[PDB]
């Protein structure tokens, strides 16, 4: 699930105190629910958020 991936990343960012990445994961989720981003672009966003989280 793209949604489950983004929720897990949001919580990992909350655990790291990474407030920008919290917002990006949270808002990709909101955009996906609103139909403002495609599922494929949300999945790619999750992958990028994960990369930035590791840095």
- The residue extents of the domains of the chain are 2-54
Structure determination technique employed: X-ray
Burial letters for 42-52: b for 16+ Cβ neighbours within 10 Å, e otherwise? bbebbeebbee
Instruction: Give the tokens for residue 11.
Output: 């919580």
CA 55 – CA 46 distance, rounded (Å): 15
Judged on CB neighbours under 10 Å (0-12, 13-18, 19+), 39 is exposed
């Amino acid at each position: 699930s793209v949604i489950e991936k983004l929720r897990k990343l949001e919580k990992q960012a909350r655990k790291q105190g990474d407030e920008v990445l919290v917002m990006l994961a949270r808002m990709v989720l909101e955009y996906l629910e609103k139909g403002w981003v495609s599922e494929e672009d949300a999945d790619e966003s999750a992958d990028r958020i994960e990369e930035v989280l590791k840095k």
